[PDB]
Amino acid sequence: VAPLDLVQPISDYKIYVSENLQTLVRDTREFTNAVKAGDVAKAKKLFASTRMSYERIEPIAELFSDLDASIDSRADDHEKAEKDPAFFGFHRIEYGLFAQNSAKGLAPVADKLMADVLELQKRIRGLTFPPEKVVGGAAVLMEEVAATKISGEEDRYSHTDLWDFQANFEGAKKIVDLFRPLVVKDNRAFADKVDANFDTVFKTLAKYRTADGGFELYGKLSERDRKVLAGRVNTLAEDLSKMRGLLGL
Ligand SMILES: [Cu+2]
Numbered sequence: 001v002a003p004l005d006l007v008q009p010i011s012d013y014k015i016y017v018s019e020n021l022q023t024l025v026r027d028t029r030e031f032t033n034a035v036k037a038g039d040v041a042k043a044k045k046l047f048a049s050t051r052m053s054y055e056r057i058e059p060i061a062e063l064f065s066d067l068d069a070s071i072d073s074r075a076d077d078h079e080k081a082e083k084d085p086a087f088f089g090f091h092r093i094e095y096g097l098f099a100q101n102s103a104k105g106l107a108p109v110a111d112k113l114m115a116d117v118l119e120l121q122k123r124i125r126g127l128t129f130p131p132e133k134v135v136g137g138a139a140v141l142m143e144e145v146a147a148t149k150i151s152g153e154e155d156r157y158s159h160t161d162l163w164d165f166q167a168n169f170e171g172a173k174k175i176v177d178l179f180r181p182l183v184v185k186d187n188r189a190f191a192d193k194v195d196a197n198f199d200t201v202f203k204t205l206a207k208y209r210t211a212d213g214g215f216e217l218y219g220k221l222s223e224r225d226r227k228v229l230a231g232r233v234n235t236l237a238e239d240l241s242k243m244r245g246l247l248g249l
Pocket of ligand 1: 055058154164
């Protein structure tokens with residue numbers, strides 16, 4: 001794959017990233033202001049779907065590692081866990097909303113979160129996307145979805161994990177789709193494989209959908225169901241890992 005042939009997919013991935021940030025900013029506005037207005041109910045129904053935008057751009061969170069750890073960090077990323085004042089973002093607000101069932105003291109965390117999403121948009125505006133970090137970030141995100149997220153660790157309090165899994169798989173697929181034209185040149189069998197693998201994982205999550213387009217609580221998956229998904233998700237990581245090889249990255 002010639003270097004110049006990598007320019008096209010990246011710039012389209014950026015438009016993609018942009019549209020998700022346009023959608024995130026909006027949904028985070030409605031979401032945060034519901035939190036600050038003490039409407040614990042509205043904020044709970046908006047939580048998972050709001051994050052989908054953020055969870056689809058997670059294959060490149062390294063390119064904004066600081067805003068990542070501000071927006072989407074979790075309790076065990078802080079030495080004082082759920083009562084650490086360094087804990088910010090969705091999952092901090094998730095604790096109050098779902099676990100403790102209140103909005104008390106969440107107004108500060110809400111505005112800071114609104115700030116970070118705006119700052120994330122401002123960043124990516126003029127941020128360049130290394131192709132190996134785009135493909136590589138995808139493969140690893142699949143690696144950690146199968147290895148670590150599978151535990152239910154990301155949304156401890158709401159158990160909205162399947163929303164996030166879906167958004168991760170969708171964001172990762174988008175990348176496979178934008179690179180398929182370069183890949184299919186010498187590895188059509190492999191491109192076809194990757195599609196069928198993603199298709200499998202989507203068909204797997206679809207068993208947990210409801211008509212709204214939402215998902216059952218993650219607890220509802222037995223530890224056997226978890227291991228079956230993990231195996232299917234791990235296949236995705238493997239492919240993205242070999243896809244970046246095949247493209248010369
Ligand atoms: Cu996340």
